[PDB]
């Protein structure tokens, strides 16, 4: 009963009654504006894990005078699931062009995630637009300074922002020239949007359902749910109800729908057919999430709203964690994997409150302190021996939280053929050989797309083209394959050469055999399940798990505090890790 | 509506109306007694995959005169998910004792799986009892010949059997001396059976639930379901209702419960608490199956009935597929992975009906024939290009069927310490060093167990001890770790040395630190997800998947027929693969 209101508070970043403070305001205050409240006690803090959560918490707590040590199992790299392939001075380069880079993990940051964007700005880092949908490159004006970060609180005309507006900045126009290739037929997204029957009949859709895009189908199925906490305007836009029944509405969403997977919600509640769910699970999101909890899809990484604006970091996503890491060169210990965690909650009495044993990745090493923030995924925590045991429900959450399997395959091309008009294909193909153009004319139209990506039901699933070229380069690296579960597992068990052949072949199925001429022979692969420090992409709740034990996930265990994407309810997002990191830094500062 | 009756028929091995023949009778007739009906057409048959399904189908169809070729991707091994670690004449031995062997895949065969057991007998192979529960070794009489295989049909006093009874054969008495270690407390199974409160309170169980074993909890939750098709006797044993409403009852089980996961069935229908489900998911089966379909647990690999008897093959489970393979040395082509499947359904007209391209594991190889039986898992089929496309629902089943991740870790010991009394620990520990015994007296009681295994919630989960010693050997190989999902993924990403240390340590948590002295330093690991020809343990349906598309799984596509565990509804069992193999052999014999 109160589980439901407390979960909606955790979900909505609402403080305890009766003040009901906006925690995102507090977090932006701390992280961006002030730093932490005057420390008071200066303490010895052990932070486990140098992903974004540990780096944000450690950078806060250190600047407040505490004695901080960050233990990182990886011997060469910080950032965790933020991972960019790029040329390193020791090693060779990942691609044939040493200037080329590409993402292995996080790649896009939404405008509705203010903590992270503001953090990137405060670190003096540059951001460009990330084109979720492919754009018309002769529209808008990106030369202007990026707009500031804006956040509107749920409260009394309370807003937060980063700086002055930049009215001369204009996003390019969505062009939707990219492909949907399902059931061996293929259309531009613009064609699918106006006549969804072309693709939907391929999934054996009939009746009313056939003439809706899967986006519309999904948004119509959700409108009665949105009604719990909001009213649609005259416009019709949505307006949140006043605070109380806005909060009591969300709490009844949790009560009514947490035992639903997204698929059972679509079949039994929205009354959609098997074929409608199959198409939704193919075009919009993935069939990953249909057996996952309803809440994972209504809040995770999905085509949120064409309304939304996305950003990327110039020079790679790694710039965020690696800049924070340089600020913390004295605190970060690399190559030390926590294998044992010992703590005292009223080591031992009088002495240190926490003791952590690490092992190198010089047989063991013991660390001590007063407080600890554990930010490692539960897939890692599972194999740490903890004494005394955690609370029962916390132990169950470690055992029962699943991580999803995801793999990214990246292919380097010497030219950005996805931008080519058929004219450009003529000019550039023949520039290499006498009649290379005529030699191909397995034939597809020219994609001629800037940004965005294509969707398919072959094992490549989602394909993304780089939003922006690497300055001074002539080619680009395509995210050729981004898939989950059994798809990802089969990707992982290929030899490297087989795997890039398969990814290239499936790319040709969409884009045309002739893309092969621009393939440099350089691929990279990231099998997040093969990563011993992640063992997956993100925490994914199955139905009922969130009310079963998520409140126990966030509770501290004596001197041990917890942070990371899995502690938030923004699973699979950077913003969830940054939120819970600030939240933990505030808490261990308190004592 | 008819989907439900046809699924119950597929489930119950009932032929079409109005004859309603017992297919298991037909399969035992064909496979064991006669061989196939006179062929008629002698044809050219391509079989893909040399697991048990392909070997059973090919051995039948060949002995009926057809021209059969079995294409096997693995370059060194047949049997697929039937895999025994053992000494090979080329390679070194898996363990320090070259006589030692242990299972990587299938290990136990139930008496209620007659096709397989009869097949093992007909191949002149030897079987011993597999002790699911640890036994009193001075009870029963295993010297006598094993009892014959008996099957009672659902029909009119129709029974099948293998041979004459063997009344002098007696199974040993269950002793339940093995451990349950959950929530840092530990009890013998015999103690848990009489006073389940000891373990159940560890899971925070209250009230009525606390005094039930999780087995009782599960069986009581299922009694109203069993009522759909059966009536419990006066005894009370269960008796199946007469045929019609026996079949109409099962069809309403499918209608009423297929949209339930096992967990939602326990929480919402049986009305069990979160803690009761947590304990059930820990002791009885695994928390694997709670988000899987209700039907996967009511039929998969689980503590079925203490009633049941299990068998193992002497010399290893590999003896079954490898004996069939020697009968087929001319038909089996090793090291050829199907990458392309082409077929004609009214190559091309007049010519061959099926064409299969393989690649070596001599750049490509093309095979042709009239009919094909594809027995490879859907995780492999996913990456084969098929032209023309399969039926829509068949393509969706390939995309949407999930395979579960399972890993087995095996540890060799020079002695069978799990059998030791404390006396034997004294005599044998001190036989190695002056006061080795006193040196240890991390202390646990002596296990003193023969067969069966122990259950825990640390990452090892289930631990099994060998039912029988290897004749003329003094030690044994323990299945130290058998786990799924995130547990298995973290097991897989350890170095080999780390992984066996972790498995040994968790074994010591249950059995006592002193087992280390008998550890030879030899481990083996099978990560079924890392296996490119399996990519998992077994097909696992999520809720509603069985009615969504399982009838489409079993349908042929022109000249292409399908077989394997996933085609049956006995997922994760050998018997399901043998059933669908016989079924396919019968069908392609028909033309
Ligand atoms: C493929 C992919 C794409 C993504 N795309 C996006 C996106 O577009 N936008 C977005 O917002 N988010 C995205 N994310 C999510 C985002 O990257 C993560 O949620 C976030 O980076 C997780 O941060 P964390 O600190 O919680 O965990 P982690 O990054 O996993 O940090 C944990 C750290 O702890 C270390 N560690 C682990 N075990 C131990 C141990 N035993 N001892 C010591 N150290 C240990 C690890 O080495 C690691 O450095 C994506 C994630 C993936 C996998
Ligand atoms: C850990 C584990 C324990 C088990 N324990 C038991 C048990 O106790 N009792 C029980 O009854 N069952 C058990 N099983 C289940 C049983 O082993 C399987 O269900 C059964 O062996 C599967 O047989 P199959 O022929 O359907 O598939 P497979 O054995 O997988 O056979 C498929 C074959 O096809 C080959 N192949 C794959 N892809 C290609 C390709 N592209 N081209 C060519 N060839 C290809 C593979 O190499 C393999 O040889 C267990 C399974 C596992 C994983």
Curated annotation (Swiss-Prot), chains A, B:
Name the EC number(s).
Answer: 1.4.3.11
Q: Which residues form a coiled coil?
A: none
Q: How does activity depend on temperature?
A: Optimum temperature is 35 degrees Celsius at pH 7.4 and 50 degrees Celsius at pH 6.0 for recombinant LGOX expressed in E.coli.
What is the activity's pH dependence per the UniProt entry?
A: Optimum pH is 7.0-8.0 for mature LGOX. Optimum pH is 7.0 for recombinant LGOX expressed in E.coli.
The question of whether Signal is a record keyword is answered with yes
Mutation effect (residue 296 to A): Strong decrease in L-glutamate oxidation. Has little influence on substrate specificity
Please provide, in alphabetical order, the Gene Ontology terms of the cellular component aspect for this entry: extracellular region
- Give the record's PTM text: The precursor form is proteolytically cleaved by an endopeptidase into alpha, beta and gamma chains, which form the stable mature enzyme. Activation by proteolysis occurs after secretion.
Coarsely, its chief localization is secreted
Q: Where in the cell is it found?
A: Secreted
**The protein's required cofactors:** FAD
Keywords of this entry: FAD, Flavoprotein, Nucleotide-binding, Oxidoreductase, Secreted, Signal, Zymogen
What this chain does, per the record?
Catalyzes the oxidative deamination of L-glutamate to 2-ketoglutarate along with the production of ammonia and hydrogen peroxide. Shows strict substrate specificity for L-glutamate, and exhibits only very weak activity with L-aspartate.
The text of the family note is: Belongs to the flavin monoamine oxidase family. LGOX subfamily.
Write out the domain note: Contains a deeply buried active site and two entrances from the surface of the protein into the active site.
Protein name per its UniProtKB record: L-glutamate oxidase precursor
Originating organism: Streptomyces sp
Supply the source organism's classification. Answer: Bacteria, Bacillati, Actinomycetota, Actinomycetes, Kitasatosporales
Q: What gene is it encoded by?
A: lgoX
């Amino acid at each position: 009963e109160m589980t439901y209101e407390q979960l909606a508070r955790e979900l909505l970043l609402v403080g305890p009654a009766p003040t009901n403070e906006d925690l995102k305001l507090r977090y932006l205050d701390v992280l961006i504006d002030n730093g932490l409240n005057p420390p008071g006690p200066p303490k010895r803090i052990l932070i486990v894990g140098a992903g974004i959560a540990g780096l944000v918490a450690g950078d806060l707590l250190t600047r407040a005078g505490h004695d901080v040590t960050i233990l990182e199992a990886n011997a060469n790299r910080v950032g965790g699931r933020i991972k960019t392939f790029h040329a390193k001075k020791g090693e060779p380069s990942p691609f044939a062009d040493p200037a080329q880079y590409a993402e292995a993990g996080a790649m896009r940051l939404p405008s509705f995630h203010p903590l992270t964007l503001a953090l990137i700005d405060k670190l003096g880092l540059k951001r460009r637009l990330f084109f979720n949908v492919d754009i018309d490159p002769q529209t808008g004006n990106q030369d202007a300074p990026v707009p500031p970060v804006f956040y509107k609180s749920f409260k009394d005309g309370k807003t937060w922002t980063n700086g002055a507006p930049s009215p001369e900045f204009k996003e390019p126009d969505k062009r939707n020239h990219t492909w949907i290739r399902t059931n061996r037929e293929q259309v531009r997204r613009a064609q699918y949007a106006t006549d969804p029957s072309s693709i939907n009949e391929g999934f054996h859709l009939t009746g009313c359902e056939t003439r809706l895009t899967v986006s519309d189908m999904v948004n119509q199925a959700l409108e009665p749910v949105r009604d719990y906490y909001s009213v649609k305007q005259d416009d019709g836009t949505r307006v949140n109800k006043p605070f109380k029944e806005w909060l009591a509405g969300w709490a009844d969403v949790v009560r009514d729908f947490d035992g639903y997977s997204m698929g059972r919600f679509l079949r039994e509640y929205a009354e959609f057919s098997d074929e409608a769910v199959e198409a939704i699970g193919t075009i919009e999101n993935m069939t990953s999430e249909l057996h996952l909890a309803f809440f994972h899809s209504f809040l995770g990484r999905s085509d949120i709203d064409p309304r939304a604006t996305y950003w990327e970091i110039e020079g790679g996503s790694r710039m965020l964690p690696e800049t924070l890491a340089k600020d913390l060169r004295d605190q970060i210990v690399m190559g030390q994997r926590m294998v044992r965690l010992e703590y005292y909650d009223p080591t031992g009495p009088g002495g240190p409150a926490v003791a952590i044993q690490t092992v190198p990745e010089a047989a063991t090493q013991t660390w001590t302190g007063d407080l600890a923030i554990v930010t490692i995924p539960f897939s890692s925590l599972r194999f740490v021996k903890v004494t005394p045991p955690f609370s029962y429900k916390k132990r169950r959450a470690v055992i029962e939280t699943h991580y999803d399997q995801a793999t990214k395959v990246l292919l380097e091309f010497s030219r950005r053929w996805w931008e080519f008009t058929e004219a450009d294909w003529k000019r550039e193909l023949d520039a290499i050989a006498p009649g290379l153009y005529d030699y191909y004319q397995g034939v597809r139209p020219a994609t001629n797309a800037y940004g965005g990506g294509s969707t398919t039901d072959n094992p490549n699933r989602f394909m993304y083209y780089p939003s922006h070229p690497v300055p001074g380069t002539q080619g680009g690296v395509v995210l050729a394959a981004y898939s989950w579960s059994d798809d990802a597992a089969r990707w992982d068990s290929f030899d490297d050469a087989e795997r890039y052949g398969y990814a290239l072949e499936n790319l040709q199925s969409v884009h045309g055999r002739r893309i092969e001429v621009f393939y440099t022979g350089a691929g990279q692969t990231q099998s997040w399940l093969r990563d011993p420090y992640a063992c997956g992409e993100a925490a994914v709740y199955t139905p009922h798990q969130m009310t079963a034990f998520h409140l126990d996930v966030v509770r501290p265990e004596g001197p041990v505090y917890f942070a990371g994407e899995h502690v938030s309810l923004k699973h699979a997002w950077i913003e969830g890790a940054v939120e819970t990191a600030v939240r933990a830094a505030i808490a261990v500062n308190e004592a």
